Ligand binder design. Structure first.
Ligand SMILES: Cc1cc2nc3c(=O)[nH]c(=O)nc-3n(C[C@H](O)[C@H](O)[C@H](O)COP(=O)(O)OP(=O)(O)OC[C@H]3O[C@@H](n4cnc5c(N)ncnc54)[C@H](O)[C@@H]3O)c2cc1C
Length: 296
């Protein structure tokens, strides 16, 4: 019995040994120049061959071979488009990719393999895709559910997918009528991803959509602390904790591995204040499919 939309999902239709070769339609830089690092939104054509569902991921095999002449390992990316896609025809798939650049031990600049291959793609370029992959981040079946989404950076991807389905499309068997609440934590305002789309959704469903941003390097709370995602959440602590107590509330978290810790710290304190052991409570939530996490 599942509380999530798992029925009839497709998994690994395409594999590393036999990937689907799609073509790049668009590749746009979506962060401003201020932004520490670039993030690109790219759309690939798949001609309806990849029947994915919101919350799933695809694997990308970047071109080239590793140091042993073998093809590169696949990298997973959460799909940033709903099942119908940015064009509404179920024939394209979109990714939100941050270009990874770091320095090794010798002080030499290293560019991450897949992220740079992807961010450098030009319209018309081919790309090997695998998947769909995943069940963890699927949407709840309940159209009247309270859905709380907490993402950092590219972690915004599966929530854009959820929200396009909920607020930008008309479906024959699905009409969202609950409360969706998105918290997006980025470092700078130039790093806010898809803000403009979320602003249009907010105007469209003002009573079904709540929106909060946390721009760490530009905002602080009363004590003067940096506005991290948990720093912005604590401001609604009483309300969120009360929401977690209800059976129709579903929590989803996606983004950088780090975010997990800072949210757990806020929660341990709220629960203890009520005589609840957060570790066991979180365990029960996870079993009930109400606490969903995908960090990397
Ligand atoms: C389920 C899932 C979904 C994902 N969704 C997305 C998504 O939507 N968008 C997205 O951008 N990414 C996403 N990722 C991450 C993505 O899969 C890649 O890991 C990412 O793009 C970097 O891969 P790469 O091939 O560019 O880097 P690689 O060439 O694999 O390099 C990564 C390596 O660089 C090293 N490294 C990184 N930072 C540093 C540093 N500061 N100093 C030293 N060494 C360092 C690490 O050891 C790491 O092993 C997701 C990952 C998972 C598991």
């Amino acid at each position: 019995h599942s509380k999530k939309m798992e029925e009839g999902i497709t998994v690994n239709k395409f594999k590393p040994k036999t990937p689907y070769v799609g073509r790049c339609l668009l590749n746009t830089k979506i962060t401003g120049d201020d932004a520490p690092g670039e993030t690109w939104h790219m759309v690939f054509s798949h001609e309806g061959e990849i029947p994915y569902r919101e919350g799933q991921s695809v694997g990308v095999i970047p071109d080239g071979e590793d140091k042993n002449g073998k093809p590169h390992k696949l990298r997973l990316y959460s799909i940033a488009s709903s099942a119908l896609g940015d064009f509404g025809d179920a024939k394209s798939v979109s990714l939100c990719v941050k270009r990874l650049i770091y320095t090794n031990d010798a002080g030499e600049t290293i560019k991450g393999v897949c992220s740079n291959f992807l961010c450098d793609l030009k319209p018309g370029a081919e790309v090997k895709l695998t998947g769909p992959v995943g069940k963890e981040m699927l949407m709840p079946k309940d159209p009247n559910a309270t859905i709380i989404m907490l993402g950092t950076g590219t972690g915004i991807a599966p929530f854009r997918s959820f929200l396009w389905k909920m607020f930008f499309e008309k479906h024959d068997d699905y009409k969202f009528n609950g409360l969706a609440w998105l918290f997006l934590g980025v470092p700078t305002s130039s790093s806010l991803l898809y803000k403009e789309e979320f602003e249009k959704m907010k105007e469209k469903a003002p009573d079904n959509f709540r929106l909060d941003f946390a721009v760490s390097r530009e905002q602080t709370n009363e004590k003067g602390e940096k506005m991290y995602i948990q720093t912005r959440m604590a401001q609604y602590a009483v309300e969120l904790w009360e929401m977690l107590k209800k059976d129709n509330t579903y929590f989803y978290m996606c983004g950088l591995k780090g975010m997990e810790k800072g949210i757990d710290d806020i929660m341990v304190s709220l629960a203890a204040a009520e005589g609840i052991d957060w570790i066991e409570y979180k365990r029960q939530l996870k079993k009930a499919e109400q606490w969903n996490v995908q960090v990397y």
